[PDB]
Amino acid sequence: NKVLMWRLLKLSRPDLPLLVAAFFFLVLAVLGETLIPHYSGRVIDILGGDFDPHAFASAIFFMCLFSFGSSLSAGCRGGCFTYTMSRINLRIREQLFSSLLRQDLGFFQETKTGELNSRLSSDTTLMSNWLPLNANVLLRSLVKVVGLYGFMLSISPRLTLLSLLHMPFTIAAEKVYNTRHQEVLREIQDAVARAGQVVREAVGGLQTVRSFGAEEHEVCRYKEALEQCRQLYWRRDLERALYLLVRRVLHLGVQMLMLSCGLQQMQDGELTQGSLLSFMIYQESVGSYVQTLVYIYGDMLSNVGAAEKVFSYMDRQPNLPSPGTLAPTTLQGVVKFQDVSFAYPNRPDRPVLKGLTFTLRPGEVTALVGPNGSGKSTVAALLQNLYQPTGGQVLLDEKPISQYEHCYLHSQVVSVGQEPVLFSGSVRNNIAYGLQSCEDDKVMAAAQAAHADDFIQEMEHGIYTDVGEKGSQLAAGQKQRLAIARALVRDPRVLILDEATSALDVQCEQALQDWNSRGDRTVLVIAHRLQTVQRAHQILVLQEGKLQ
Amino acid sequence: QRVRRLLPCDLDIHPSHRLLTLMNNCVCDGAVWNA
Amino acid sequence: PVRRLLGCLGSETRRLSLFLVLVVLSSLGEMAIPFFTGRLTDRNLTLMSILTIASAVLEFVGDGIYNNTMGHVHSHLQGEVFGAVLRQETEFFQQNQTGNIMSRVTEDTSTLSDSLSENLSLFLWYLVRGLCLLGIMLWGSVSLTMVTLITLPLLFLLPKKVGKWYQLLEVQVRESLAKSSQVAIEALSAMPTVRSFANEEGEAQKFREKLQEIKTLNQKEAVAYAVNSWTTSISGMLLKVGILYIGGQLVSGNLVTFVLYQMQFTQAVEVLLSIYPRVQKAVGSSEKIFEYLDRTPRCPPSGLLTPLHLEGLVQFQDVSFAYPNRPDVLVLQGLTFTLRPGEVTALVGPNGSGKSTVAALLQNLYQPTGGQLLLDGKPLPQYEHRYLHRQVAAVGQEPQVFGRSLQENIAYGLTQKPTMEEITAAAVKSGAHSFISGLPQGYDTEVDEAGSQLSGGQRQAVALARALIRKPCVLILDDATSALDANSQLQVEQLLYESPERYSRSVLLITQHLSLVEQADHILFLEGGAIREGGTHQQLMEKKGCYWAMV
Ligand SMILES: Nc1ncnc2c1ncn2[C@@H]1O[C@H](COP(=O)(O)OP(=O)(O)OP(=O)(O)O)[C@@H](O)[C@H]1O
Ligand SMILES: Nc1ncnc2c1ncn2[C@@H]1O[C@H](COP(=O)(O)OP(=O)(O)O)[C@@H](O)[C@H]1O
Ligand SMILES: [Mg+2]
Ligand SMILES: [Mg+2]
């Protein structure tokens, strides 16, 4: 509807200098086109009547001059319209991506990432590709139609008769067609996103597919999705063709009726043969211009009204607390729970944590153990302010965890995931991930601290060697060591080792046991079994969301 | 003479949107000038 | 180069011909109006309306046929591009990231088929209308039509000269779009890690660099558009001026009709001139998809051997391997070992010694670069793909779980849907039934992407159930020893060492821990890509004292 276009104009406002230039030129373009027929008719009649070489040359010369003047302005206008289209598209994509990252983690479980990417790719183009031709035709018809209506002075009391019996017929059909056209476009979009998700899944996890030999199954699934999209495409095209047919028939009928009425006027009215054909031209032109303008306006409305979910994502407010501000220069490292109970927001009414009251202090390693699905990982997530507790509170240094600044909290408190994920890029940019500035002297110390230098040197370009997507060019132990180095390089005060030693071999399992060597860190280790944490100062046993 | 026309009035609109007319060449921008 | 864009279209060749005959009929009907009604200044109104209505109906039918044919072509091409993409070797997907591949599959095809749909009908319509106009002009005056047709080819020289530039520009634009999509997907897929390390603004900036690289090329695109729009109009007006001059020299009263037809033929030529740059741009855009469609894979073709009975006799003969991106470094150095039915062979070694590479080689993902690997006396490529991947099953070090129902994840890849009793049996055997029955929706429970909803050992249990539902002949276990719970561990050891179904299987247990390697028939120590020691637990421990677990 018009509400979304108002937002579209709101974000299109920075491009006004291009729009005024485009309006400026197209006005010049049409004022140039309005002069060509004069000299064309002049040269035609001079060639047909008594021939004269001299008047011929002047007429053709002025025709050439005006043809230069109009053509330059037309091409010079199309260029700027095309450029502002791309500017709008890029701004829309950038703002959509900047808004997606701001969402809470619950949003990313409810929606598939492949569909998100397919929407970000396709819906913005659907939003902005119509500009270089829809706006040009609409504006040109809008300026030209005013002149033909102003020629109502030919026969005054009949163009009102045009206005009062032409509108209601056309307007209703446009509304009826648009109501279905917008819906079918929205369905086409929500089907194409679902089709793209299949390609996302098939290509992302291709090694498993090849291990199970199911390439043809995925091909069949994608072909089914493409057929589902093709049906909607055909429906939209057929309905558009039907609307075009009915529009043509209505225009022909009304023109025939007015021709009959104009003939009926000439017997006694203030009309003559010379005036009648003079009037008919203006009436035909105004009818064609208005019937093109209505169609263009309706199409422009629904194109925007089709990709509504992009606007919904753009202005969605995440389910997060207000950003923190606290950032003391010194952080003690004391963290404690207070009757913390949690249930995941995506499937609530299913308590994972019943109640926890443990406390941690610096230099005293604490081990958390429990069966599969006990709730250790959710405790680690709550410590990192990834989810908010539904009961009680999490206090760090006697302050609520949500009150610390994001860039400071995530610099002081870091963790190692159960299965870490590494981003594509150089190894030094993975170890120093998320840091504005980091010298190689710190990265090489972090590599030594994580027993990583023994294999980094063997790479193709040393520490500058590229790593494939998701870390698919390294062994599992090498990924684990890089993840450990990533947490170590940030000199954290609170370190959470969520099953970090699972993928390592016995030499590294025993060598890195002394995480409290510095003696000024609050270290939490999560272990599947009690044996590996016999050295822990404090041991917490968790089952069914309750600690022993 | 007023020779008939077999092409759309505007060349930048797809022929599917042609909107057939009765007067043909009498409808173009040349007749908007007229005099 | 243009021939590919016509080869991808030439599947139907019948609907397009019918549309062409329909548009020819419509053009004839529109041309026939004045000779029946009267040329100018007209009981006579009825037949004219009848002709107009007939033309409108014919146009509607032609448009419907053309739209349906274009939808069919779009669907076929978009399916075939993906079908050709999935055939490439596993090395190819290390050079091209998934966020680039799916951007190429989904966006390039939908742009090429949109440009083709928008341009083909326009070109045909203006071609037939220009042909009719030229046919009239031939009756107008033969010689002037001849000179106009003679000077017409001169106007094609400049677009022909500037043709390649559009292709090389569009290739860069499309590759920048693909690179941007890669960053978007990589940021969106791993959101918890991005949030944990607070690198959101870094991802935004990295996306903005690609957007800036696109914005730089878009300006040149707009400038080229403007200059082309200048040149085409200048040439179009020059065409009519250079023949008005000839008419002036010639003067003969019938020249008026011929000039009024030339001023329309010149607009048809002007439109056909603007058609060309879009054809060049479309040729440029489809560079990568028409490389995917015909790039020959490096893998050997699959055979046709499907024995009804098979035994998991797997043996290695001096196998050596090197990953394609670093061929100068040999990851494996002359391995040689044999598997037999009923025995469990444990592969043990430090991190990065090549165990998972051995597992990948056994699954025929990569071909050996030395020696030969044989299964039951036959090389792996000689077997049918589906048969080979049914008889050989494995559990990855990080098993991927697809976002669908648990009954379909366990039964993934099978040629037919198993009965519910088979899935229940497999889930009980792997121990997954201890937690599957606790889910509110049971086996119909939806699974979030990559198994994010499941716990640690539950993923390994589901992967083992998926591997066991096929009743494989060779079983590989990369990490289903550590993360498993107490019940699942007992089930795993029971199936490995005491279940009756042992004697039909050969097991390659890959694990660097002592959890289950004590009872293995053979223990192979892999250090630096080469086997160092071999033998049973007592034989291995005797020659080194406290071989491992010193503390
Ligand atoms: N795609 C690849 N391209 C190049 N080198 C690779 C690739 N994948 C692995 N490597 C290298 O090959 C060697 C063997 O890796 P592999 O994954 O086989 O180790 P692993 O013994 O299974 O390790 P772990 O026990 O830690 O899981 C390592 O040096 C690794 O960096
Ligand atoms: N993102 C999520 N949304 C909803 N439920 C979840 C999510 N992640 C885990 N759960 C459920 O909550 C429980 C938390 O267990 P978890 O802490 O993951 O076990 P572990 O500590 O072994 O990783 C699990 O049983 C799981 O089924
Ligand atoms: Mg491995
Ligand atoms: Mg866990």
- Six-digit token pair at A51? 């021939």
Q: Which H helix or E strand runs over A352?
A: none
Q: CA–CA separation, A298 vs A177, rounded Å?
A: 9
A415 with A300, same domain: the answer is: no
Length of chain C: 551
Separation in Å, CA of C23 to nearest CA in chain B: 11
**Residue B11 touches partner C, C-beta closer than 8 Å:** yes
List Cα–Cα distances, C19 to A235, C28, C33, C121, C423, in angstroms: 19, 14, 22, 9, 54
Output the domain CATH number for residue A399. Answer: 3.40.50.300
Which atom of ligand 1 is closest in space to residue A458's alpha carbon?
A: 29
Partner-chain contact A284 B16, CB within 8 Å: no
Give C335-338 contacts, CB < 8 A, sequence gap 24+: C335/C371, C335/C526, C335/C530, C335/C531, C336/C531, C337/C522, C337/C524, C337/C531, C337/C534, C338/C313, C338/C314
What's the distance, Cα to Cα, between the start and end of chain A in Å?
58
What is the distance, to the nearest Å, from the Cα of residue C235 to the centroid of all Cα atoms in its chain?
Answer: 43
Q: C197 with A414: CB under 8 angstroms? A: yes
Q: In 10 A of CB C307, how many CB atoms?
A: 11
- Six-digit token pair at C525? 């120590």
Based on the structure, what is the number of domains in chain A?
2
| Residue B35 amino acid letter | A
Per DSSP, the residues of B18-35 read ----SSGGGGSHHHHH--
Partner-chain contact C267 B7, CB within 8 Å: yes
- Six-digit token pair at A18? 């291009």
Q: In 10 A of CB A263, how many CB atoms?
A: 12
Q: DSSP letter at C21?
A: H
A377 is a domain residue: yes
Measured CA angle at A329 (ends A326, A333), to 5 deg: 80
Closest-CA residue to C116 (of C11, C229, C224): C11
Domain interval for residue B30: 1-35
Closest-CA residue to A498 (of A526, A536, A530, A538): A526
A260 with A356, same domain: the answer is: no
**Residue B6 touches partner C, C-beta closer than 8 Å:** yes
Q: CA–CA separation, A161 vs C314, rounded Å?
A: 92
- Six-digit token pair at A388? 């908010």
What backbone torsions phi and psi does residue A338 show, to the nearest 5 degrees? -140, 90
**Residue A468 touches partner C, C-beta closer than 8 Å:** yes
A383 with A292, same domain: the answer is: no
Q: Any residues with CB less than 8 A from the CB of C297 and at least 6 apart, and which?
A: C87, C88, C89, C92
Q: CA–CA separation, A224 vs A191, rounded Å?
A: 11
Strands A466-467 vs A494-498: parallel, antiparallel or unpaired: unpaired
Helices C200-250 and A53-100 pack at an angle, to 10 degrees, of: 170
**Residues forming a β-bridge with C335:** C319
Q: CA–CA separation, C268 vs C137, rounded Å?
A: 14
Length of chain A: 548
Q: A119 with A190: CB under 8 angstroms? A: no
Range 247-266 of C in CB contact (< 8 A) with A: 247-248, 251, 253, 255-256, 259-260, 263
Partner-chain contact A196 C53, CB within 8 Å: no
**Residue A60 touches partner B, C-beta closer than 8 Å:** no
Q: Any residues with CB less than 8 A from the CB of C435 and at least 6 apart, and which?
A: A373, C458, C461
Range 58-97 of A in CB contact (< 8 A) with C: 60, 64, 67-68, 71-72, 74-76, 78-80, 82-83, 86-87, 90, 93-94, 97
Q: Any residues with CB less than 8 A from the CB of A168 and at least 6 apart, and which?
A: none
Q: DSSP letter at A464?
A: G
C144 CB-side CA count, 13 A: 28
Please give the radius of gyration of chain C, using alpha carbons only, rounded to the nearest integer: 35
What is the stated resolution of the deposited model, in angstroms? 3.3
> Could you give the residue ranges of the DSSP H alpha helices within A266-338?
273-306, 308-314
Q: A218 with A198: CB under 8 angstroms? A: yes
- A179-193 burial code (b ≥16 CB/10 A, e <16): eebbebbbbbbebbb
Closest-CA residue to A142 (of A338, A300, A372, A15): A300
For residue A37, which residues of chain B lie inside 8 Å, CB to CB? 29-31, 33
Q: CA–CA separation, C200 vs A407, rounded Å?
A: 10
What backbone torsions phi and psi does residue C509 show, to the nearest 5 degrees? -90, 115
- Six-digit token pair at A359? 């406390």
Quote the ligand 4 centre to A373 CA distance (angstroms).
Answer: 7
C443 CB-side CA count, 13 A: 18
A410 is a domain residue: yes
Q: CA–CA separation, A363 vs A494, rounded Å?
A: 10
Measured CA angle at C340 (ends C336, C346), to 5 deg: 65
Ligand closest in space to the Cα of C349: 1
For residue A476, which residues of chain C lie inside 8 Å, CB to CB? 351, 356, 397-398
What backbone torsions phi and psi does residue C508 show, to the nearest 5 degrees? -110, 95
- Give SS3 for A459: coil
Domain interval for residue A220: 2-314
Q: C476 with C363: CB under 8 angstroms? A: yes
Closest-CA residue to A542 (of A334, A367, A289): A367
Q: CA–CA separation, C551 vs C548, rounded Å?
A: 9
Q: DSSP letter at C515?
A: T
Based on the structure, what is the number of domains in chain B?
1
Separation in Å, CA of B13 to nearest CA in chain C: 10
Range 172-211 of A in CB contact (< 8 A) with C: 195-196, 199-211
Separation in Å, CA of A212 to nearest CA in chain B: 50
Q: Any residues with CB less than 8 A from the CB of B12 and at least 6 apart, and which?
A: A133, A136, A137
CATH number of C314-542: 3.40.50.300
CATH number of C3-292: 1.20.1560.10
List Cα–Cα distances, C386 to A214, C369, C504, in angstroms: 8, 24, 20
A388: exposed, middle or buried (Cβ count in 10 Å: 0-12, 13-18, 19+): middle
A60 with A173, same domain: the answer is: yes
Q: CA–CA separation, C348 vs A74, rounded Å?
A: 75
Q: A77 with A25: CB under 8 angstroms? A: yes
What backbone torsions phi and psi does residue C523 show, to the nearest 5 degrees? -120, 125
| Residue C385 amino acid letter | H
Strands lying side by side in the sheet with C522-527 = C392-395, C474-477, C506-510, C344-348, C522-527, C530-535
In A398-527, where do the E strands start and end? 399-400, 413-416, 425-426, 466-467, 494-498, 522-527
Helices A53-100 and A113-128 pack at an angle, to 10 degrees, of: 160
Closest-CA residue to A401 (of A347, A432, A360): A360
Q: CA–CA separation, A384 vs A389, rounded Å?
A: 12
C491 CB-side CA count, 13 A: 21
List Cα–Cα distances, A493 to A323, A334, A368, A521, in angstroms: 21, 10, 18, 5
**Residues forming a β-bridge with A416:** A497
**Residues forming a β-bridge with A369:** A527, A541
Closest-CA residue to B28 (of A317, A289, C252): A289
Measured CA angle at A349 (ends A343, A351), to 5 deg: 40
Ordered by start, the domain boundaries in chain C are 3-292, 314-542
**Residues forming a β-bridge with A496:** A415, A524
Q: In 10 A of CB A230, how many CB atoms?
A: 18
A290 with A222, same domain: the answer is: yes
Q: In 10 A of CB A135, how many CB atoms?
A: 19
Q: C278 with C116: CB under 8 angstroms? A: no
Give A108-111 contacts, CB < 8 A, sequence gap 24+: A108/C188, A108/C191, A109/A346, A109/C448, A109/C452, A109/C453, A110/A346
Q: C258 with C140: CB under 8 angstroms? A: yes
Q: C201 with A62: CB under 8 angstroms? A: no
Q: Which H helix or E strand runs over A271?
A: none
Which residue in the block uniquely carries the two structure tokens 């609307």? Answer: A243
CA torsion sign, C223 to C228 to C229 to C235?
A: positive
Closest-CA residue to C52 (of A253, A421, A415): A253
A232 with A373, same domain: the answer is: no
Q: CA–CA separation, A304 vs A135, rounded Å?
A: 13
Q: Any residues with CB less than 8 A from the CB of C83 and at least 6 apart, and which?
A: A219
Closest-CA residue to A369 (of A498, A480, A477): A498
Closest-CA residue to C478 (of C444, C504, C525, C512): C512
Per DSSP, the residues of A181-250 read HHHHHHHHHHHHHHHHHHHHHHHHTHHHHHHHT-HHHHHHHHHHHHHHHHHHHHHHHHHHHHHHHHHHHH
- Give SS3 for C338: strand
Q: DSSP letter at C301?
A: P
Please give the radius of gyration of chain A, using alpha carbons only, rounded to the nearest integer: 36
Q: DSSP letter at C501?
A: G
List Cα–Cα distances, A133 to A484, A485, C264, in angstroms: 55, 55, 22
What's the distance, Cα to Cα, between the start and end of chain C in Å?
69
Q: DSSP letter at A316?
A: P
Q: CA–CA separation, C134 vs C27, rounded Å?
A: 14
Q: Please tell me if the CB atom of residue C361 comes closer than 6 angstroms to any atom of ligand 1.
A: no
**Residue B22 touches partner C, C-beta closer than 8 Å:** yes
What backbone torsions phi and psi does residue C181 show, to the nearest 5 degrees? -65, -35
- Give SS3 for A429: helix
Q: CA–CA separation, C200 vs C170, rounded Å?
A: 30
Q: C64 with A238: CB under 8 angstroms? A: yes
Q: A47 with A67: CB under 8 angstroms? A: no
- Give SS3 for A438: coil
A530 CB-side CA count, 13 A: 5
Q: Which H helix or E strand runs over C378?
A: strand C378-379
Q: In 10 A of CB A153, how many CB atoms?
A: 8
Output the domain CATH number for residue A51. Answer: 1.20.1560.10
